[PDB]
Design a protein around this ligand. Sequence first.
Ligand SMILES: C[C@H](CCC(=O)O)[C@H]1CC[C@H]2[C@@H]3[C@H](O)C[C@@H]4C[C@H](O)CC[C@]4(C)[C@H]3C[C@H](O)[C@]12C
Ligand SMILES: Nc1ncnc2c1ncn2[C@@H]1O[C@H](COP(=O)(O)O)[C@@H](OP(=O)(O)O)[C@H]1O
Length: 272
Amino acid sequence: LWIEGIPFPTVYYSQEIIREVRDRFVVRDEDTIIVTYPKSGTHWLNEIVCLILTKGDPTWVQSTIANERTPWIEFENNYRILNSKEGPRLMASLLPIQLFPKSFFSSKAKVIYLIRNPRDVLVSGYHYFNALKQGKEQVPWKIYFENFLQGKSYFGSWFEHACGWISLRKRENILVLSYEQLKKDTRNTIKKICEFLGENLESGELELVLKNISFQIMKERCLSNIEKHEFIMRKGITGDWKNHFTVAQAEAFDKAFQEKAADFPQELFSWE
Ligand SMILES: C[C@H](CCC(=O)O)[C@H]1CC[C@H]2[C@@H]3[C@H](O)C[C@@H]4C[C@H](O)CC[C@]4(C)[C@H]3C[C@H](O)[C@]12C
Ligand SMILES: Nc1ncnc2c1ncn2[C@@H]1O[C@H](COP(=O)(O)O)[C@@H](OP(=O)(O)O)[C@H]1O
């Protein structure tokens, strides 16, 4: 289904809902949003955000689900519950910039946009989208590669979703993060988001938020609902694409990228 020329999953979304979210859904200055592209460490960051809030106690995140923890605006009829006004409102989304609520661009509510190596995103998506895809209807590696190179993937081309969203990286209320800088520069990134959010830490609580976000701890984690509960934590490693991209595929990816996103490749593109 192409909703406003955008590819979505076949359920949990509608045109009336996604159109209503872009033009008339209203964000308060006190509402926070976690916007990401799929297979980029979405659940990781979400859990880090909640674990700072609880001062590192993981009991809350064990008895909850990411959607039922940070509801997703465009997800089904969730926006109806979200219209209830409760001071601070924590939400999440996966939308590219052109379809994000137009109202947000005139208000200064806080947004965290997470990014990851598209090749690692490609590899992470390939595994997950083929984990439990009716057995042998599972897509081969080449089909998936050329499908990612074109825009044929959920929530659009990774380039347009990113280019549109990262055109605001130097804006006041925009915080851009990388999955890579969370793997390499882990504790000093949490100190940096705490500076953008005014939430402060004590030298005991820091060693607690940081313990329970580790892959292994998070790997051992309430109700398993409709989505895959166990095939989410696959590797958690950075640069697994080198185990998947042939050299001819890495050249075809480097030429598409070096042509598509021309203006942004300076900092944050330091993953290597
Ligand atoms: C169902 C679909 C995958 C279909 C497939 O097997 O290709 C997946 C891919 C991305 C998923 C979403 C994203 O992972 C973000 C959210 C994560 C939450 O844990 C559930 C809701 C949430 C909004 C997910 C709903 C649903 O499970 C989605 C939309
Ligand atoms: N606690 C954690 N620490 C490190 N990586 C994590 C993590 N939780 C999830 N991830 C990784 O984040 C990716 C999932 O992205 P998303 O959250 O957007 O669906 C997966 O990558 P891999 O498939 O490379 O293992 C998963 O392993």
